[PDB]
Structure 1
Amino acid sequence: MAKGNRRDLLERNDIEVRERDKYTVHTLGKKKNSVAVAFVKAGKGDILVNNVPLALVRPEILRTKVSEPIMILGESLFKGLDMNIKVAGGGHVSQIYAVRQAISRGVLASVKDEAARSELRAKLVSYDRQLVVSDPRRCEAKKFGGRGARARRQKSYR
């Protein structure tokens, strides 16, 4: 139903305006048609996805996948801050990965000391690179010889 590029999402008018102005940071993640927008501020360590905490995301098995950067970097920073994510686009898993990308990038922007930002980059990218750099590959078009992009209709010679 949701479309990702909608203006109602990128600005996150969901939040009320007096509260919309306390959020300093902004961030983006993506994977396939999925897009996630994060509004990071100052708090005491709370995260939300579509008005749902991080412990109760639904595929269940990937909860570790979204909690990864915390147990990597450490909980100190996140405990310092508080976040409110919102995602919209194709697929459960795509949404998972977009969300984790947004987490990581946003916490990267919270620090102002570039040196620490680079150190954290090295610390984190080594474990994985898709936590910072978006995956580029995307669904590809089909052709009229058959019912697939590269597969063809079966041919009968005799």
Structure 2
Amino acid sequence: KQVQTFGKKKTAIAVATVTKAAQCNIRVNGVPVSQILPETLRAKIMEAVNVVGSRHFARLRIDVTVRGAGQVAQAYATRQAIAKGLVAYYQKYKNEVEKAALKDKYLAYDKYLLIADPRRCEPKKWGRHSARTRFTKSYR
């Protein structure tokens, strides 16, 4: 039993491959979760899984391939694709009731879940550097 979802935030896309387990501790890339070098980002990725059952619903084997932005945005993207995968699994193989329980509690707890946070970038324009602070003034 499988589903495959994606995270998207900034220019990082994550790809969450779900393959049926009823145990497996969740991991990322080539480095699992206890060996993720930035402790802070590790903690972010934890709150995804930890909340809404620590290993009570989080029992699927979920590994990811995340590329396309710096370390921080990849960790964000990770959380998203994980929780997406759980939800979609509990949609197909299991009733809407269980999904509604899980989902509602995700939505509540400040990520939102649903949002890609799709605020990207600015263009550089004119005759001007970034958004305005110009060169610096001539007298007026």
> What's the TM-score, normalizing by structure 2?
0.87
Identity level (%): 44
- Determine which of 6, 12, 16 is the counterpart of 1:38: 16
Aligned position for 1:25: 3
Q: Is 1:154 aligned with 2:133?
A: no
**Do 2:15 and 2:65's aligned partners in 1 also have CA atoms closer than 8 Å?**
yes
Q: Is 1:145 matched with 2:117?
A: no
> Over residues 5-24 of structure 1, what are the superposed CA-to-partner deviations in whole Å (9 max), with x where a residue is unaligned?
xxxxxxxxxxxxxxxxxx62
User: Root-mean-square deviation (CA), in Å?
Assistant: 1.7
Task: Kindly indicate which of the two structures has a greater share of residues assigned to strand.
Answer: 2
Aligned-pair CA distance for 1:103: 0.6
- Deviation of residue 32 (structure 1)? 0.7
Shift of 1:48: 2.4
C-alpha distance in 1 between matches for 2:100 and 2:115: 14
Name the CA distance, whole Å, in 2 between partners of 1:131 and 1:62.
17
**Paired residues of 1:25 and 1:109 also in contact (CA < 8 A):** yes
Distance change >3 Å, CA 117–CA 134, structure 1 → 2? same
Contact residue 69 and residue 104 of structure 1 kept, 8 A: yes
Unpaired segments of 5 or more residues in structure 2?
none
Distance of 2:120 and 2:6 partners within structure 1: 18
Shift of 1:118: 1.8
Give yes or no for the alignment of 1:120 onto 2:102: yes
Matched with 1:51 is: 30
Matches within 5 A, 1:65-80: 65-74=44-53, 75-79=55-59
Residue deviations 1:99-127 (CA, integer Å, cap 9, x gap): 00011110111113112212211111111
Distance in 2 between the 1:69 and 1:98 partners? Answer: 11
- Unaligned runs of at least 5 residues, structure 1: 1-22
Structure having greater relative contact order (Cα 8 Å, sep ≥ 6): 2
Match of 2:84 among 70, 93, 105: 105
The corresponding residue for 1:16 is none
Contact kept in structure 2, 1:47 and 1:82, CA below 8 Å: yes
